[PDB]
Design a protein around this ligand. Structure first.
Ligand code: ANP
Ligand code: ANP
Ligand code: EUI
Ligand code: MG
Ligand code: MG
Lengths: 276, 311
């Protein structure tokens, strides 16, 4: 991809100030005239198998467009250097949005935001793309509109010892299937992400919509790994402080220990409807 | 208290050479060699230039919002009040280049994990003395500043050719624990079964960690899962099944053929899964194994330097 292979007309794109680092390159603000987010990646892997998967996935994302999914625009690869360009999201991350004092969530607003997220995930799933990284920090809320970012991105194999370092916010969104497989020397690309793991991550963001915090208070990651992958921690949170029966029913469904008992996103739309 | 005078005359000696060094900053120091690195940051043998002293510098690398960074440094400065013959000599803590550095005593023989790998196994005669040292350090910490350690394992037990035992890297600062230290998981686990399920824990969790550490050093092998029958006379698992073992299976125990009841019972009491029934520190201090080893006569410095090769 030389960026002219995309349906977005491109003359020139300029880097602006950076706006956060992470495991997958550095994300800058930029100007396409429109604002954009530009993620800079570098491919250690070089074995042309990694770039083959990168090319496949970037042209798979071309086929996407939906008002609840961030617009994928371009990707160019001058190996080892690669760049992924999406539309820039004004407004605030849902993560920092539920955690605001001044914010007024309610039994209505929460269902509406949730239905937005479900529509977006349902599209992505229909076209066979798995998010693999749904969380509150990868959803943006600007006035009425809700947009999912940073999807599909965990499938790639760029630069990131035999220990592990796992942020707590991330692990709260991880289903038991995954955290059981975590262990030093195993890369993120080998983990069992899936449609069901995505609806589990939706379970955590819904809990965050109810309680405006993590479902597990910050603690040693080994503790979180056991509590998450045993299902115990999720059994105890459902016990500990409850919300409403119909609200909590969707939560118990999404967090279901056996992944196969987790609902589809289409079904979750209906469940969110039959509520106050 | 209950501070011997030999000890009190080497504590004063190091607090008053301590005020001779004054303050510091990065370029005052100069490298020597690779002590090692892990679960946060590298530590290197260093010589300080203003005041002819050799130290050990712990650098850990944390780009985060500066407000909590200065909160961390001010919480970490409490190490200046923490001074015992069983806690490594602390000198200073400062921020530089967004890399927090802690300057502490250099301990000639390194960590009992290092000691162990070269030694292969650690005898009982001597594990008695280290056990006394650990309970003393933990009681000093709980009574005087009201903190707990939260990470007791051989790589955090330090030994010198002068024959002392002291503990390093205890959890003094909460912010540093919540902001960095929590996110790491290694290949082994020393966490109590009540910490792993996320209930409220206490220094009891440290009692468990100490028990597991003593087993490892006594038999030379990380004790869970328990060695198999062929491996025991002679003397590949992911992290979650390790943790599920710790929580859902019996704890390790020392082999019955080799060590006394007093040692076997000491470790059995440290490793009870229910922290309520696990011995506390008051009870461990008066245990038979402790009364024995405290009144025994072992020359530690000699064993250490002939184990590893110092002078
Ligand atoms: N399209 C976008 N519009 C606005 N902000 C964005 C967009 N994409 C990413 N960001 C932000 O840019 C930063 C980079 O995100 P990211 O590198 O994924 O860090 P992270 O999600 O917090 N942790 P990690 O996923 O491991 O890198 C974060 O603050 C994102 O919220
Ligand atoms: N004050 C010290 N004096 C001498 N050696 C030390 C000192 N502190 C740490 N070490 C050694 O330096 C190496 C790395 O130390 P450290 O960064 O604390 O990781 P670790 O001790 O191996 N395990 P952890 O405490 O979980 O990080 C180990 O071999 C330690 O034995
Ligand atoms: O370096 C530390 C450490 C952790 C918490 C804290 F509050 C500290 F002050 C720490 N450093 C420290 C404290 C006292 C002395 I005397 C010397 C020191 F270097 N740690 C914890 C540690 O043992 C690891 C980190 C995380 C996982 C396992 N424990 C390393
Ligand atoms: Mg992200
Ligand atoms: Mg250490």
């Amino acid at each position: 991809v030389y960026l002219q292979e995309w349906d977005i007309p491109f003359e020139q794109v300029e880097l602006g100030e950076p706006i956060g680092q992470g495991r997958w390159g550095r994300v800058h603000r930029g100007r396409w005239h429109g604002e954009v987010a530009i993620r800079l990646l570098e491919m250690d892997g070089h074995n042309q198998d990694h770039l083959k998967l990168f090319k496949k996935e970037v042209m798979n994302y071309r086929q996407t467009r939906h008002e609840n999914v961030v617009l994928f625009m371009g990707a160019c690869m001058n190996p080892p250097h690669l760049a992924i360009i999406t539309s820039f999201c004004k407004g605030r991350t849902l993560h920092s949005f539920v955690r605001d004092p001044k914010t007024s969530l309610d039994i209505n607003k929460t269902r509406q935001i949730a239905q937005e997220i479900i529509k977006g995930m349902g599209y992505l799933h229909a076209k066979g793309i798995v998010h693999k990284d749904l969380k509150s920090k990868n959803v943006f809320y600007d006035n009425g509109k809700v947009v999912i970012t940073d999807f599909g991105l965990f499938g790639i194999s760029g630069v990131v010892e035999n220990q592990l370092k796992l942020s707590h916010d991330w692990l709260c969104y991880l289903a038991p299937e995954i955290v059981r497989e975590m262990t030093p020397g195993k890369d993120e690309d080998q983990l069992p992400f899936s449609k069901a793991a995505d609806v589990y991550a939706f379970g955590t963001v819904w809990y965050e919509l109810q309680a405006r915090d993590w479902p597990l208070k910050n603690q040693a990651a080994e503790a979180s790994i056991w509590q998450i992958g045993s299902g115990e921690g999720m059994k105890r949170v459902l016990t500990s402080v409850s919300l409403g029966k119909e609200v909590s029913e969707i939560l118990s469904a999404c967090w279901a220990f056996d992944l196969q008992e987790r609902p589809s996103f289409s079904l979750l739309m209906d469940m969110l409807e039959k509520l106050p | 208290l209950e501070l011997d005078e030999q000890q009190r005359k080497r504590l004063e000696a190091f607090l008053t050479q301590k005020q001779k060094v004054g303050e510091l900053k990065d370029d005052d120091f100069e490298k020597i060699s690779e002590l090692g690195a892990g679960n946060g940051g590298v530590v290197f043998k260093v010589s300080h230039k203003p005041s002819g002293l050799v130290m050990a510098r712990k650098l850990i690398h944390l780009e985060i919002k500066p407000a909590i960074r200065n909160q961390i440094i001010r919480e970490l400065q409490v190490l200046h009040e923490c001074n015992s013959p069983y806690i490594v000599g602390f000198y200073g803590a400062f921020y530089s280049d967004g890399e927090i550095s802690i300057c502490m005593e250099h301990m000639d023989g390194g960590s009992l994990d290092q000691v162990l790998k070269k030694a292969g196994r650690i005898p009982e005669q001597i594990l008695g003395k280290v056990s006394i040292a650990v309970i003393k350090g933990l009681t000093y910490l709980r009574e005087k500043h009201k903190i707990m350690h939260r990470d007791v394992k051989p790589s955090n037990i330090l030994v010198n050719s002068r024959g002392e035992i002291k503990l390093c890297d205890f959890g003094v600062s909460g912010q540093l624990i919540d902001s960095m230290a929590n996110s790491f998981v290694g290949t082994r686990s020393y966490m109590s079964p009540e910490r792993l399920q996320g209930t409220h824990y206490s220094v009891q969790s440290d009692i468990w960690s100490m028990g597991l550490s003593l087993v490892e050093m006594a038999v030379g092998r990380y004790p869970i899962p328990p060695p198999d029958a062929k491996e025991l006379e002679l003397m590949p698992m992911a992290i979650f099944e390790l943790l599920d073992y710790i929580v859902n299976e019996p704890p390790p125990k020392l082999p019955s053929a080799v060590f006394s009841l007093e040692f076997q019972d000491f470790v059995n009491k440290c490793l009870i899964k229910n922290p309520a029934e696990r011995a506390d520190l008051k009870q461990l201090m008066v245990h038979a194994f402790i009364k024995r080893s405290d009144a025994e006569e072992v020359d530690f410095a000699g064993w250490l330097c002939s184990t590893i090769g110092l002078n």
